Amino acid sequence: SKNVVIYADGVYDMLHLGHMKQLEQAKKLFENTTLIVGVTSDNETKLFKGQVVQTLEERTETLKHIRWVDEIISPCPWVVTPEFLEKYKIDYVAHDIYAWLKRAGKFKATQRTEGVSTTDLIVRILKNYEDY
Template sequence: MKPYKIGYTQGVYDMFHIGHLNLINQAKALCDYLIVGVNSDQLVERYKNKTPVICQEDRRTIVENIKAVDQAVIADTLDKTEMLQALGFNAVFIGDDWKGNARWIRTEEELRRFGVDVVYLAHTPDISSTALRKATEQTGSTACVEET
């Protein structure tokens, strides 16, 4: 039996890569039903000050077609309490590279009041959409993370 009935994770998922897939698969291993929030184009523009390469509907379609994903939704907020009220989950999954971050410490405290756990999952090292974007802009080449 998995520890959580409904899990939630959220991200941009622009230039989808193996780190995204690893996190989604780890999250699904811990819950019966996994909802993935795909940050809207407007949300990404507001907090990252950049426009996604792939539009939100295409990113949602990519994510919803991953075997481990039970439901993909467009997320217009980073506020996990707001997402909890809309979706009703038992756990939020996030990469462990965010552990100790002030925003996530506050999120843990807020969600704890509702009995929701924040679960930090192993972050895939040396891969990010930002790194991929920089690598392709500088060299025109592709990036691949070797399995170890």
């Protein structure tokens, strides 16, 4: 009956059924939650992880439309820290380097789904043109 504050962060480029399944998961970890979602900046994402198709603005505007999302932090810090949790009253971090979080009892796992990615769909479109 107590409202539990959950935080998940990510890039959320080209949001697809896989991200939304993950968010729904985070959001339903408990009966009553506030799901806060953090969206990584363009600068840091490109430099530390890989290429990004959509700007911060775009990746964040799409998340506004997902029913599980209660609040958004955009851009979000690239590294989560104890101070960040305190600042936002976050009870758990939902994700799939996490050591410190598990240690603190503040880590809750979520899963991915395969073959649901937007890149996979372009694949499917192209099958319509046999190789010969």
